[PDB]
Amino acid sequence: MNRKIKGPCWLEVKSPQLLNQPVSWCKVEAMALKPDLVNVIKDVSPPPLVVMAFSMKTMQNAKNHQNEIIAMAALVHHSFALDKAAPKPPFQSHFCVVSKPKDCIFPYAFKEVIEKKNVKVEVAATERTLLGFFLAKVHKIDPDIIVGHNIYGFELEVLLQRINVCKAPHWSKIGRLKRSNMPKGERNATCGRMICDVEISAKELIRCKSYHLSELVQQILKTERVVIPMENIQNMYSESSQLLYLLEHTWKDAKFILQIMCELNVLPLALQITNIAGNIMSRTL
């Protein structure tokens, strides 16, 4: 209120002091003694940002009712316009990874088939290595906006719980700020990065029978996505071909989520709504 800041707008800071020790994972840091030292400048256009669309497959543990992440996939777009049309293709790179939770023995010659196909995929020995690789990748890509399905309620919470249980190094890599102690967290979990759930945004924009991913893709993109029941994937891990099929299906799901977000252009809508209202874009999304 005091600085008359109305949503995302170019802010110019005078007398930027450089703090001795890093406080975040960002490339540049600055200091401000008083709030009055920073002013608002208007006549500038928004810069392009990085957008990463991610999707993962959890599985209830065989023994007793615990979710376990086994497969991850994510598409990246470094230079994503926020005022122009959604870039086509919506991405220029991606990465996927798979792992055996506790006893799902890898099918014979799995990595051999992977290298034979020469498709973009890496194999992680265990959930801990999977999460470590994911955190390293997200930090190296520093995506400003991370978009997914059911991130608000299911995906983000399970990701955080798995990271905490596995005690993966630098859990704070998810957010741009570095914190030593686990938080316990409505938005503190992803401090610095903009999480966008396609279902809530679609509910905001369009109306559908049910906002589940399959129904949304049907009503929006007029295409059908094959649903893989979680109960059938228990034996899925004993054969390389169908495991690669599952991985490619997760990649397809990530592509569908990204396409829904792009064609529904929820990002520019959020920009304009936040600018009109002046609130925090994260609260808008």
Interface with another protein (CB under 8 A): 60, 64-67, 153-154, 157-158, 161
Longest dimension (CA), the chain: 64
CB of 64 to another protein, least distance (A): 7
Contacts of 64 (CB under 8 A, 6+ apart): none
Of residues 165, 135, 132, the one with CA closest to residue 66:
165
Handedness of CA 86, 75, 143, 27 (dihedral sign): negative
52 phi, psi to nearest 5 deg = -120, 125
CB of 67 to another protein, least distance (A): 5
Residue closer to another protein, measured from CB, 64 or 235: 64
For every residue of 66-97, DSSP letters joined together read -EEEEEEEEEEEEEE-SSSPPPSSS-SEEEEE
CB of 129 to another protein, least distance (A): 21
| Pairwise CA distance, residues 25 & 188, whole Å | 15
CB of 154 to another protein, least distance (A): 6
Identify the helix (H) or strand (E) that includes residue 147. Answer: strand 145-148
Within 10 angstroms of residue 86's Cβ, the number of other Cβ atoms is 21
CB of 228 to another protein, least distance (A): 16
Residue closer to another protein, measured from CB, 114 or 195: 195
| Pairwise CA distance, residues 264 & 46, whole Å | 20
CB of 153 to another protein, least distance (A): 7
Residue closer to another protein, measured from CB, 60 or 238: 60
Residue closer to another protein, measured from CB, 232 or 241: 232
